[PDB]
Design an enzyme around this catalytic site. Structure first.
Site, short mmCIF file in Angstrom:
data_model
loop_
_atom_site.label_atom_id
_atom_site.label_comp_id
_atom_site.label_asym_id
_atom_site.label_seq_id
_atom_site.Cartn_x
_atom_site.Cartn_y
_atom_site.Cartn_z
N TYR A 1 -10.66 27.70 19.28
CA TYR A 1 -10.35 28.98 18.65
C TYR A 1 -11.64 29.63 18.13
O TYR A 1 -11.84 30.83 18.28
CB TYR A 1 -9.37 28.79 17.50
CG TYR A 1 -9.30 29.97 16.55
CD1 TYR A 1 -8.68 31.16 16.93
CD2 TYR A 1 -9.89 29.91 15.29
CE1 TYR A 1 -8.64 32.25 16.08
CE2 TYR A 1 -9.85 31.00 14.43
CZ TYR A 1 -9.22 32.17 14.82
OH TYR A 1 -9.18 33.24 13.95
N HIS B 1 0.80 -1.23 0.00
CA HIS B 1 0.00 0.00 0.00
C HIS B 1 0.84 1.29 0.00
O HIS B 1 2.04 1.26 0.25
CB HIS B 1 -1.01 0.02 1.15
CG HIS B 1 -0.39 0.14 2.51
ND1 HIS B 1 0.25 -0.91 3.14
CD2 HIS B 1 -0.31 1.19 3.36
CE1 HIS B 1 0.68 -0.51 4.33
NE2 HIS B 1 0.35 0.76 4.48
N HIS C 1 1.01 5.60 1.18
CA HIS C 1 0.55 6.69 2.03
C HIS C 1 1.08 7.97 1.41
O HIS C 1 2.27 8.09 1.13
CB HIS C 1 1.13 6.57 3.44
CG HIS C 1 0.50 5.50 4.28
ND1 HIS C 1 -0.51 5.77 5.18
CD2 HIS C 1 0.74 4.17 4.37
CE1 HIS C 1 -0.86 4.65 5.79
NE2 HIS C 1 -0.11 3.67 5.32
N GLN D 1 -13.40 33.30 18.90
CA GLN D 1 -13.61 34.13 17.71
C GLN D 1 -12.44 35.05 17.36
O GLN D 1 -11.66 34.79 16.43
CB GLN D 1 -14.94 34.92 17.79
CG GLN D 1 -15.04 36.03 18.82
CD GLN D 1 -16.11 35.78 19.89
OE1 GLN D 1 -16.95 34.90 19.76
NE2 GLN D 1 -16.07 36.59 20.95
#
Ligand code: MG
Ligand code: MG
Ligand code: MG
Ligand code: MG
Lengths: 141, 139, 135, 139
Positions: free
Chosen positions: C131, C66, C68, C135
Site C-alpha cells: 500500500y 500463562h 494471552h 501511496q
DNA sequence: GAGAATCACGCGACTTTAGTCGTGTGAGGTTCAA
DNA sequence: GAGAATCACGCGACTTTAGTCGTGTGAGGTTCAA
DNA sequence: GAGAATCACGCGACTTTAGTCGTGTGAGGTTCAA
DNA sequence: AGAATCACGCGACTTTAGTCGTGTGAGGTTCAA
C-alpha cells in the site's frame, strides 16, 4: 473515537464475456510411494513439461516448485476451467511424457504410475477471507 | 538483536476419496439495470431461496450479504463442483423463484431478467497469496 | 478498476490511530495454577484493571501457566506502564482473593518478571508495504 | 470429512532485559497546508535527516517513503520508546533542520511550521490480526 | 458556505531553544487528505 | 545443561504500599518455555 | 503391527491411448507425508 | 462514444423461466459491485 477510514487501490482482475474473475489455486501432489526422484535434469524436464501442458490448456503458472518427492503449483484459471480437468491434464500428461523422456524412472516406478493418486488443492486470494468479509460488510450504507 | 522464533499454525481442510481440499469463492452479481429492489422482505426472501439452493447443491454458505442492488456470497465447495454450474443454479433458480414469490418486482424488471448477465468470482484463502508463496519457497 | 477497502481507526485531538498489542506473560516458575475459578477470577481482575486504565480488551485467554491478551490503546498509553498495571495489580489482587496460590508461590511473586509483546495490525506488514508503494 | 493440517513458520523477535518483543509502527504525517514541497533534493535531504534522527534515538527504519506532501515510515522500536516521544523527535527536529538546510521552503511555509500538527500511527504485525487471534485459540 | 486531523488562536513541556508533542476551542487567517 | 526471559540477588519508582515496571549481574537457591 | 490421501485390488471416462480424473473397497503387494 | 453491465443472435438445462455457455453491435430500462 470510532472512525471508519477508506483506502483506494487499483483493481486488476480478469474479464471474460459475462464474468469478471481472479481465480488462483495452490495445487500439490506427490510422487508414487513418495520416491525422491524429481532431482537434477529430471526436475528441469518436469518443469518444461508442466509449463507446456499449462500453456496448451490456457492455465497461467504463477509459482512452480519441484521437490524431489512432490510438486507445488500456484495456477490462475478461468471460471470455466474445472479443477478435476486441469489436475488430470497436468498429472496425467506429465506422467506419460516423463516416463518417455526419462525411462530410468522405471527403476523405482515400474507399476505404471509416476504420481500418487491423490492431489491437494486450496483456493488463493491476494488478501484474506477475514479482510474480504470486512470489505463486504463495508459495502452496506 | 533478533532471534528467529517459530509457531504452529492450524489449517482446517476437507477430505474426499482421492483429494484433500479447502476451496472457497467470493461470488458477486448485481440486479439487472442495477435497480435497488433487494430490500425489506424481498431481501429476506432471497436469502431463504439462496440458502435452499445452496443446501440442495451441497454448497456451504460462509457469508451472505444482500445489498439493494447486488449480492455478495462466500461459498465453500468440493473440487468436483464447477463454477458456472453453481452460479447458474444460484442465479437462475433464484431469479425464477423470486419473480413467483414477489411478482411486484416486475414493476421495474419486466424484461424477464432479475439478474445482470455477468458474475464476478474470486478464489479465497485464509492466508495471503504472498504468505502462501513464502510457505511454498520454504519447501 | 478501483476498490475502496475499509480501515477502522480511532481519533483524538491531534492524532488518528489504531494500536493493538498482543501481550503475553507466564506464571512464576511456570507453575500451572491458573485453572478453574482461579482462572475465572483472573479474567475478572484483568478486565477491571483494563477498564480502570482505559484499555480495550480485544481477546483474552488464560492458560494454566500463562496469559494471552490482545489490547487496544491510545498513542499516549506507554507499554511499560500498562504492563505494570496489568501484572502488578493482578498479582496483588489474585493473592488476596486466592490465598491457596501461596502453596507453590510463596516467594512473593505470581508472575514471571518478563513479558512478551508484539504490535498487531489488520493487514500483514507486506500488505502495508505494498500500500505504501502505491501511496 | 475433515483433515487438520499444521504448518511450521518462523517469526522474528527481539530480546531485552525483562522483555521479548516485535514492535513496528506505520507512522504518517503531512506537510503543513498539504503543500507539495518534498521533491528533488529537498526530499533527499529529509530522508538523510529522518534516518539520522531515527539512528540517534535507536529506532530502526524498516520502510521510508517521502511523497511531495507527506511521509510514510515503518519503524521498529523497543517497549520503552513511547510514541509521542519519537513522533515529536522525528517531526520536530526534522522541521527545524529542514528549514535551516532548505531556506527556500519559507516561500510557501512562512508561518513557522513545516508539518501538519497531526500524525497517523498504526501498530504493525508480520501476520494479520485474525491469524494472531486464531493462534491465541490454538494456544 | 463550513469542521477538523488537517485552518486559526490559547496554554506548558522540551528539543530543534524552533517547532513538535501534550492540549481546548472557534472562525474564515496559506488546508482539504495521507 | 547452563544461560536467561524465564532462577537469584542488587537498585529506584510507584501502585497493588505489594509486586510489577525500570534495571545489572551472577550463581546454582521453587524455572525450562509462552 | 494395519489406515488411508498416500499401499492394493475393482470400476468408466478420456487424454497422455497411458495414466490421470471420477470412484468403492480391503489387505499386508515398492508408501508413510506435502 | 463500451461492455460485465445496454441490445440483438445462438444451444443447454433448470427455474420450462432465466440463468449458464456464447458473438456481436447499437444506441432502446444500465453505469458499477
Ligand atoms: Mg486419483
Ligand atoms: Mg451470463
Ligand atoms: Mg520485569
Ligand atoms: Mg500535534
Amino acid at each position: 473515537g470510532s472512525h471508519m477510514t477508506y483506502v483506494i487501490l487499483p483493481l486488476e482482475m480478469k474479464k471474460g464475456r459475462g464474468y469478471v474473475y481472479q481465480l488462483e489455486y495452490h495445487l500439490i501432489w506427490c510422487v508414487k510411494y513418495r520416491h525422491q526422484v524429481l532431482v537434477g535434469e529430471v526436475a528441469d524436464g518436469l518443469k518444461d513439461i508442466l509449463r507446456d501442458i499449462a500453456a496448451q490448456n490456457g492455465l497461467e503458472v504463477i509459482t512452480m516448485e519441484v521437490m524431489p518427492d512432490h510438486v507445488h503449483l500456484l495456477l490462475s484459471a478461468t471460471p470455466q476451467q474445472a479443477i478435476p480437468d486441469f489436475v488430470k491434464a497436468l498429472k496425467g500428461a506429465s506422467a506419460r511424457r516423463m516416463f518417455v523422456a526419462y525411462p530410468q524412472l522405471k527403476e523405482k516406478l515400474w507399476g505404471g504410475n509416476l504420481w500418487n493418486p491423490s492431489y491437494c488443492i486450496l483456493t488463493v486470494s491476494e488478501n484474506t477471507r477475514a479482510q474480504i468479509q470486512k470489505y463486504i460488510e463495508s459495502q452496506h450504507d
